[PDB]
Design a protein around this ligand. Structure first.
Ligand SMILES: [Mg+2]
Ligand SMILES: [Mg+2]
Ligand SMILES: [Mg+2]
Ligand SMILES: [Mg+2]
Ligand SMILES: [Mg+2]
Ligand SMILES: [Mg+2]
Ligand SMILES: [Mg+2]
Ligand SMILES: [Mg+2]
Ligand SMILES: [Mg+2]
Ligand SMILES: [Mg+2]
Ligand SMILES: [Zn+2]
Lengths: 114, 82, 177, 101, 66
RNA sequence: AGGGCUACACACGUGCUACAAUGGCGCAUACAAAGAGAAGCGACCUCGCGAGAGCAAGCGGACCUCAUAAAGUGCGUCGUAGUCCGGAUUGGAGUCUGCAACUCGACUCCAUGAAGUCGGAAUCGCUAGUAAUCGUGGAUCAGAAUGCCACGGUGAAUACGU
């Protein structure tokens, strides 16, 4: 339970545990476990060292937590330093893809100020 | 976005202006209205003035602005605050 | 060491020819590179000074000295002797190593890089730059950095004049827009 | 509708019909993979641009044939909602009765 | 120099996209795989005489129709 | 021609989605009604994880297509946790319509995985195939619905009384 540099949980099935990797959801998790050949309903606790090692290799073949953070943050910074419309929206902390901001922009603006 | 089978989009007048500028032009910013035209690597190093509704904002092309149309870098709604 | 040897042979001989000197030691040698970060927000975020010191340690393999306020300034709300910055001085092999690292790795990574400002001499042949983004330096992790803060660098040189300093740096293959 | 919306739509219809079967073949050229995409498709895109915009059927608003109202149109009667109701209750629309089920 | 206050300043190999590989004593913790270096930068050798392996080709040249 | 009606320190109305286990997910299996179609619906076959793409018949329609109904039933799992609840935001990669999808379309894949733990003053609908929920169709429509108008599936509780 030390895949990709995190401490993926015990007592959870393989899919649910590998969901905890920042960059692996349900689909990528099941793809990794299928490539590794293990049944999907078995806990991480009862996975042997070699099986965990091939899981680590496949996760490394995919993108990992800190790496994914690095590219997503550089893409955001790329938008900002281009100063496109999306760069302006990211800088301002307003919705970027064209939602209404007269109302319903709270998840992007934070709670109401006054 | 625009599909791959159709290729990117660019206004033909913009193509002619950019081609003329790169082959025999270092004079003046290219006054363009096509906010819908994708940026190609031909217009690198140009300083084109793109319309945003009332005036032409200058935008200087850089190595990374690739899959962006000219309107991405021209604001249309001035807003200071409240 | 590599660019040190390149200096000692090629730059020494070509500058000798360029300046028509009588002695070898008359060629501009280099004393040091001083890297400063005038943090100036430690008052708000005291831990920002620690972050900057660790950051400078990452660029150059030296624990920085905490530069303290020379005297109290009411305009900037600083007192006398308050730790308002960090510095590292590199001279010798570590100087040369940071020098190759900078010139060959960090400089081309500058965002929209159009060369360096070709007029940044004090007046007797010592050069200086200010880099806006620390991220240009490969030693940065970009994940354990709270703020994208810049720094400034000063190559202090034995050059007799601005032209001698510029010639030395050009022999060292600087951009010089 | 000012007579000018009406004239505009009339010329849009005329221009779209007079360029029809050219825009269609250009769309086919852009769509079909079997046709060369290097230069032929590119020139097709450029020509499709150089064709006047009003020739596109997408610029049809389907105004009312009588009052040129843009909103409330119905294709079956070719009339706005209110003119449909007026003509219906007068009896000029065949087979139309106030439904109730 | 002083002991047990400086960071680790081990040797690393820095390889970039153009095939330039250089050995440098630095403080990173592992080998470096960068992209742009002295030789493979436009301004260094020819402002309009360089080729890239990034945005000008990757996102575009695999998709363009010209 | 472009921009704006899509601007956002804020308030309000009307809705959709949730806060979960009467449920989330995977597999198998059932049962509708009512509509629309020719510069349109578009089988089958092949391809793509998918949006969808190529070829391509039938149909002016009790004949062909849209069109795999969904809730449900059984099988397993999840185990009361902000979780396999939530899918809001955000990056990358795309499909289609259209001259063009950046301002400013909808969907598809991956990843990101917010508030929300049943909601104060107050306040709305409904007396039965009604409320509640489940899905399907239509007009508008090149593309663009949680809206509007229709259609069926399950299917209540209560009405002492003024
Ligand atoms: Mg994950
Ligand atoms: Mg609005
Ligand atoms: Mg229309
Ligand atoms: Mg009219
Ligand atoms: Mg107009
Ligand atoms: Mg939902
Ligand atoms: Mg019929
Ligand atoms: Mg949460
Ligand atoms: Mg979560
Ligand atoms: Mg009643
Ligand atoms: Zn290189």
């Amino acid at each position: 339970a030390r895949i990709a540099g995190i401490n993926i949980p015990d007592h959870k099935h393989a899919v649910i545990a590998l969901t905890s990797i920042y960059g692996v959801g349900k689909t990528r998790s099941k793809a990794i476990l299928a490539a590794a050949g293990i049944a999907e309903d078995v806990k991480i606790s009862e996975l042997s060292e070699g099986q965990i090692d091939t899981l680590r290799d496949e996760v490394a073949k995919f993108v990992v937590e800190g790496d994914l953070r690095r590219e997503i943050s550089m893409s955001i910074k790329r938008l900002m330093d281009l100063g496109c419309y999306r760069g302006l929206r990211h800088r301002r902390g307003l919705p970027v893809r064209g939602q209404r901001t007269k109302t319903n922009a709270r998840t992007r603006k934070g709670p109401r100020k006054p | 976005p625009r599909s791959l089978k159709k290729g990117p989009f660019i206004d033909l007048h913009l193509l002619k202006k950019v081609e003329k500028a790169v082959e025999s032009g270092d004079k003046k910013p290219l006054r363009t209205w096509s906010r819908r035209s994708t940026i190609f690597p031909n217009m690198i190093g140009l300083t084109i003035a793109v319309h945003n509704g009332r005036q032409h904002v200058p935008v200087f092309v850089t190595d990374e602005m690739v899959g962006h149309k000219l309107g991405e870098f021209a604001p249309t709604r001035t807003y200071r605050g409240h | 060491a590599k660019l040190h040897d390149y200096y000692k042979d090629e730059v020494v001989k070509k500058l000798m020819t360029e300046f028509n000197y009588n002695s070898v030691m008359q060629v501009p040698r280099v004393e040091k590179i001083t890297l400063n970060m005038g943090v100036g927000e430690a008052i708000a975020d005291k831990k920002l000074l620690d972050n900057a010191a660790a950051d400078l340690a990452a660029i150059s393999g030296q624990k920085p000295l905490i530069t303290k306020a020379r005297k109290s300034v009411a305009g900037f709300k600083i007192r006398q002797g308050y730790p308002i910055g960090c510095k590292v001085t590199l001279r010798g092999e570590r100087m040369w190593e940071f020098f190759e690292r900078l010139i060959t790795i960090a400089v081309p990574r500058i965002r929209d890089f159009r060369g360096l400002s070709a007029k940044s001499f004090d007046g007797r042949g010592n050069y200086s730059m200010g880099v806006r983004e620390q991220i240009i330096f490969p030693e940065i992790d970009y994940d354990k950095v709270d703020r994208v803060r810049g720094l400034d660098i000063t190559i202090t040189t034995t050059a007799k004049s601005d032209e001698e300093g510029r010639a030395l740096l050009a022999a060292f293959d600087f951009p010089f827009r | 509708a000012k007579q000018s919306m009406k004239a505009r739509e009339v010329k849009r219809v005329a221009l779209a019909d007079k360029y029809f079967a050219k825009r269609a073949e250009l769309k086919a050229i852009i769509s079909d993979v079997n046709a060369a995409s290097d230069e032929d498709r590119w020139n097709a895109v450029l020509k499709l641009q150089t064709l006047p915009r009003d020739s596109s059927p997408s610029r049809q608003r389907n105004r009312c044939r009588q009052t040129g109202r843009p909103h409330g149109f119905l294709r079956k009667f070719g009339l706005s909602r209110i003119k449909v109701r007026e003509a219906a209750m007068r009896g000029e629309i065949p087979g139309l009765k106030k439904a109730s089920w | 120099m002083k002991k047990d206050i400086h960071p680790k300043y081990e040797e690393i190999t820095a390889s970039c996209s153009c095939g330039n590989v250089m050995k440098i004593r630095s403080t990173v913790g592992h080998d470096l795989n960068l992209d742009v270096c002295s030789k493979c930068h436009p301004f260094f050798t020819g402002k309009q005489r360089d080729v890239a392996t990034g945005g000008r080709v990757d996102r575009f040249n695999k998709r363009f129709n010209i």
